[model samples]
Target chain A: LRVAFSAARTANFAPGTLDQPIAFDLLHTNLGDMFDTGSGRFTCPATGAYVFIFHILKLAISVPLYINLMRNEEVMVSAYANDGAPDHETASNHAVLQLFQGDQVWLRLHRGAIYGSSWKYSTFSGFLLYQD
Target chain B: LRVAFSAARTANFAPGTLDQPIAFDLLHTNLGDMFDTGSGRFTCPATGAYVFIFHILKLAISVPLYINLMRNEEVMVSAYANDGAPDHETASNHAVLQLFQGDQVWLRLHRGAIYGSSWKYSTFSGFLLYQD
Candidate 1:
């Protein structure tokens, strides 16, 4: 069966470490409940240098979070802030993950301080824009 | 002159990292005085593969940051988020030394609860738009 992602919004990642991998736990709330009950997890059927994009609304002083591309629970391409600097709103991040076919790419959030908003699907969405 | 960037805005990049690379430590401050300090201490200078375009922002559940192509201490491109998520506005963008020719890159945050903001030269300024 072919599945098509019609609409998605990170604004519903369930707000908590519940859906999270367990090993990974964060303080703030990200894109909660992306599955939307029975929407089904969006699995990477195939992979090869996949694009992993997303955005945040804004944050305060607290620490930030960690973003990465996971395959079988392992990080493929990752993103984390360790500047040790202060807080700044307009400050955001982005990256790309070079995944292998059937690698099962996923997103994970490490625990931090204040936490900003949800990883609304709209906040971060990608497609087979291109591949090999 | 083979130089070094002892005090860039990693932590002391100065809160807000200060788009203007505000001078901090009064003593080690990069601004107000460094005056392109180089200090023998710093050198200055300055993306690729289309087909795949994506992001790495999560700000809530993940702390994301990544940097590439930074020759010399210039940090041509950067993304720093001391306290936020991959998608939270609580993220950032940093650089190696300074300038565009170098190709310094950055991204991500600290996987905590709060991811604030700040981008030197301007808040959240991580786009060449592209160059040739």
Candidate 2:
């Protein structure tokens, strides 16, 4: 089972609610249609070890950004970025997880805002490594 | 062959040397032992496509942080983070690279200091994607 997907945010995300799932509107590659661009979640199609990575750029507005990589409602890892100068900073992390066929993975915007553009400063990508 | 590794820094890195390789002292995963934790470099074991990603948190000292993903002394991509408030920020980037056997890849601290902790705010991970 070959699986890989990469997506990016195309428009700025000014958060209205906390713990919102980041919806990446731009799709770069979706090998198996496992990643849903509409909802910004990757549903595991097959049980295996998969690698997920993300780089999120926060808006240049003196606010700290907090992000969490969630695996089926569980936080696998979290990243933080803040700038007093209100510069565009990034929050990034990666995890190799053992997933079940129906498990879902996604990024949650815990705080602050994100900057998006055609430059693709923020991206998320995942691929199947070893099938279980 | 299966190749994958993840490592993180455990102590603060106040850079005295320029263009130094950011050494990660903590090892989480190193399958097939392709990643050298001592030298902070990943030596490609087979000619294949690989994915490398990193997140480095800068020290809260008002210094801008610059990082580059280096492949055999060549910069594949670069990331920057800075704050006027002298707060902690992160610089992150990723690349999907085709490498030949014995080719080396690592992260360079182009400028500024990095914060390290057991919490692992900074991390580097890589995996073999497709064999050539």
* Candidate 1, A23-117: lDDT as tens digits: 21221222322222232233555543333344432234445444443445664333443323444333223333333455544444443322332
Question: Compared with the true structure, what per-residue lDDT tens digits does model 2 show for residues B15-120?
Answer: 7877999888876668778888778999999999998988888898867899999999899999998776677878888899999999999999999999887567
DockQ of each: 0.06, 0.35
Instruction: Report RMSD (Å) for each prediction in the order shown.
Output: 13.5, 3.9
Reported per model, the fraction of native interface contacts reproduced equals 0.06, 0.39
lDDT: worst 10-residue window of model 1 chain A:
A21-30
TM-score of 1: 0.36
Provide the overall lDDT of each model, using Cα atoms, as 2-decimal numbers.
Answer: 0.31, 0.87
Per-prediction TM-score, please? 0.36, 0.73
Top candidate (DockQ): 2
Query: Which structure among the candidates has the greatest lDDT?
Result: 2
Clashing pairs in 2: A84-B85, A85-B84, A85-B85
Q: Report, to 2 decimal places, the DockQ of model 2.
A: 0.35
